[PDB]
Amino acid sequence: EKFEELKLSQPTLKAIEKMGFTTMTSVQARTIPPLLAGRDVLGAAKTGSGKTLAFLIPAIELLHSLKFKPRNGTGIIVITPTRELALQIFGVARELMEFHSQTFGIVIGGANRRQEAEKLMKGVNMLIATPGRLLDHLQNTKGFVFKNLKALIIDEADRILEIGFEDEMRQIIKILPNEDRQSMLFSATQTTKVEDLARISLRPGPLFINVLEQGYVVCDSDKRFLLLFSFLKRNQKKKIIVFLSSCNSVKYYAELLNYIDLPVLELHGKQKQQKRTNTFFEFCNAERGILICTDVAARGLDIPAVDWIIQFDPPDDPRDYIHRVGRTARGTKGKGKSLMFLTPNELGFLRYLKASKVPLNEYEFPENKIANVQSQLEKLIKSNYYLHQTAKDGYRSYLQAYASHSLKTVYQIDKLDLAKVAKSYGFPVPPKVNITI
C-alpha cells in the first residue's frame, strides 16, 4: 500500500512527495485503485481517515488524462456540508495541483458573490462547493460552463441531509449531467435518506467500502478572548488544546499570543501539509505548551493525552462533540479535562448536554482577575498593519462560521452583539462584514 505502486502522472507524484505522504492508509489503499478503473464508490470512511486524498487523486488524474483547459468549464464538482470543511478540502487540493495546469476554485456560503461569479467566468476546472451556493451559481450565473462534468463527489452525505440540504441536493442532481459523469458518495453512517440520495446520483450497483464530566464557562462576548488569555497564561506549564471555529481565527490567535510572549503552536487548513505534520508531531512529545487548532483539522488526528481541551468557539458538529467527550476519554487514559465557553445568548446548548444524559459541571471565574491587557491589544491593532489585517480576517471568519451554523435554535447571529465581538479582537468599532443578519 504505497503511493509509488499505483501508475500515476509525474506532477501527482511530485506533489505527493512534497506533502510527505509515502505509505497510504487502508481507506486510500482499497479505494484509489478501483477509482482509477472508473467505477463508482459508496464509501463509509470517517472524516479525517485519509479519504480526502482518496477522492482527490482520481479527480486530478482524470483531469490530467482528459487534458482540460480553462475554456472547457468544470470537470470535477465536490460537495461538502460545512463552510470550514470545504476550506480544508480546497487547501488540500491547492497542493495536489501545484505543478498541474488545471484550475481549482471554492464556492461556499458567506463569501463574495461577484468574486465567485467571476472565478466561474474565467473557467474553473475543479470546484469545491457547498450545496446552498451551488444552486444559486447554477441557476443564476451566465457563463458558468458545467456541461463537461466528468465526475461528482459527495462528502458526508449524512451531514448534508442532517443540515437540511436534501432538496438542494435533489435539484442539483436534476441540473447536473448524468451520462459521462461517474459519481462518488461518502458517508460515515447511512440512514434511509442516504441511499435515497445515492440511488439518484450513482450508477446502479456501485461498490461500497466498509471501515468523565464535561465542563463549561459562561463568558461575555467582549471578554471571551481576554479570559482565555488569562487562563492560558496562568496554566502555561500544562498541556492545553484550544479549538477554534475557523482557520483565520486560529492563525490570528496564535500570532497574537506569540507577539505577547506566550508560546503557542497553530494548526489550520491554510497551512502546508508538512508544516501541519511537523507541528502536530512536535506537540505530541513536548509535554508542555498550548496548541490552537480548528475543529475539523483535529477530527482525523488522534488527540494525545493533554491536561485541558478548551472549545473556545461553537463546535462545527455538536452531535460529534457530545460523543467525543466520552470517546477521547475512552481512548486517552489520562484525565483530559474538557472546557466549553458559552455566551449568555447561546446558553441553550446545555439542553442538548442535559438531554443526551452527560454529566455537566460549571466553572466560575472572578471578574477582577482578568488579564487587563485590552488597552495594549487595542493600541497594538491600531499600529501594526499586519496584525490589524489578521484580526479583521479572524473577525470575518468567526462571523461567517457563526452565521452558517446548523444549530440555528442555539447559535443565531441575530442575537450576537457585533460591537462586543469586535471588542475582543481589538476593535473599538466593528469592521464591516457582509453578512445577512
Partner RNA sequence: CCUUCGAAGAGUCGCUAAGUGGGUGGUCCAUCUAAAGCUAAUAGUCGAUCCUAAGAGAUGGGGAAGCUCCGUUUCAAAGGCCUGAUUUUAUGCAGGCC
Residues making contact with RNA (CB under 7 A): 103, 106, 111-112, 114-115, 118-119, 393, 396, 432-434
Distance CA 253, CA 391 (A): 8
Q: CA 276, CA 281: separation in Å to the nearest integer? A: 8
Q: Which helix (H) or strand (E) holds 342?
A: strand 337-342
Query: Does 45 carry a binding-site annotation?
Result: yes
Q: Which secondary-structure segment (H or E) carries 267? A: strand 264-267
Q: Give whichever of 122 and 203 is closer to RNA, judged by the CB atom.
A: 122
Between 94 and 351, name the residue whose CB sits nearer to RNA.
Answer: 94
Give the DSSP H or E segment for 309: strand 308-311
Longest Cα–Cα distance in the chain: 66
Q: At what angle do helices 131-140 and 113-122 cross, to 10 degrees?
A: 60
Backbone φ, ψ for residue 115 (5° rounding): -65, -45
User: How many Å apart are CA 122 and CA 127, to the nearest integer?
Assistant: 13
Q: Please tell me whether 46 is known to bind a ligand.
A: yes
Q: How many CA atoms lie within 13 A of 383 on its CB side?
A: 6
> What's 286's DSSP letter?
S
Shortest gap between Cβ of 84 and RNA (angstroms)?
A: 13
At its nearest, how many Å lie between RNA and the CB of residue 114? 3
Find the shortest distance in angstroms from Cβ 49 to RNA. 26
Compute and round to an integer the Cα radius of gyration of the chain: 22
Q: To the nearest whole angstrom, how small is the minimum distance from the Cβ of residue 103 to RNA?
A: 7
Q: Is 51 marked within a binding site?
A: yes
Question: How many other CB atoms sit within 10 Å of the CB of residue 155?
Answer: 24
143: left (phi over 0), alpha (psi -120 to 50) or beta: left
Q: 25 labelled as ligand-binding?
A: no
Shortest Å, Cβ 368 to RNA: 37
The minimum distance between CB 324 and RNA, in angstroms, equals 29
At position 3, the amino acid (one-letter code) is F
407 SS3 class:
coil
How big is the chain, counted in residues? 437
The least distance separating RNA from the CB of residue 40, rounded to whole angstroms, comes to 30
Feature table: binding site for ATP: 45-52
